[PDB]
Amino acid sequence: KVFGRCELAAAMKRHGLDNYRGYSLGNWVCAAKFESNFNTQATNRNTDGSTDYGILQINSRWWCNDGRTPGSRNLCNIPCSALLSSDITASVNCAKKIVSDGNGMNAWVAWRNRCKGTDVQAWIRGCRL
Ligand SMILES: [Br-]
Ligand SMILES: [Cl-]
Ligand SMILES: [Cl-]
Ligand SMILES: [Cl-]
Ligand SMILES: [Cl-]
Ligand code: NA
Ligand code: NA
Ligand SMILES: [Re]
Ligand SMILES: [Re]
């Protein structure tokens, strides 16, 4: 599913990301825009053989099982395919674990480079919320 900006803001709010670990809703919308272009089916293969999945491009080295990242972990206890669903619940619940691990939203390279320190509240303006 390819979300619109305001549609995703509303879904992220419904599914519990608003101010999770102190990160306002716009941080998450901005991160999703630049990680996945709001596409739940986004995937990116890294040159280490791991893959990033879903609207927040969650990586198979630590967070999900894809059967093709040898020796990796699955801390979210999910198949990586669950991160591609039109329902963002699994991505949200896994993102909650990631952002809680000590590094906050710096786990998301696009957030650090393109959202951190900007007026992230802009990403939710004009939306029915
Ligand atoms: Br949803
Ligand atoms: Cl694996
Ligand atoms: Cl699995
Ligand atoms: Cl933090
Ligand atoms: Cl915000
Ligand atoms: Na990325
Ligand atoms: Na894995
Ligand atoms: Re939707
Ligand atoms: Re703003």
Q: Where are the domains of the chain?
A: 1-129
**What 3-state DSSP class applies to 52?**
strand
Residue 7 annotated among the catalytic residues of the structure = no
The Cα-based distances of 121 to 5, 60, 70, 124 in angstroms read 12, 30, 39, 6
From 52, 66, 87, 119, active-site residue: 52
> H-helix or E-strand containing 89?
helix 89-99
How much helix, strand and coil, in percent to the nearest 5, is found in the chain? 40, 10, 50
Resolution in A: 1.0
Residue 24 near residue 125, CB atoms below 8 Å: no
The answer to whether the annotation marks 101 as part of a ligand binding site is: yes
Name the phi and psi angles at 86, rounded to 5: -65, -30
How far is ligand 7, taken at its centre, from the CA of residue 78, in Å? 9
Phi, psi of 19 (to 5 degrees): 65, 20
**Which approach determined this entry?**
X-ray
Q: Report the length, in residues, of the chain.
A: 129
Type of residue found at 116: K
Question: 1-129 belongs to which CATH class?
Answer: mainly alpha
Ligand 4 centroid distance, CA of 68 (Å):
31
Give the pair of three-digit tokens for residue 128.
């029915």
Residue 6 DSSP symbol: H
- Please give all residues whose CB falls under 5 A of ion ligand 1, grouped by chain where several chains appear: 11, 87-88
Neighbours of ion ligand 6 (CB under 5 A): 57
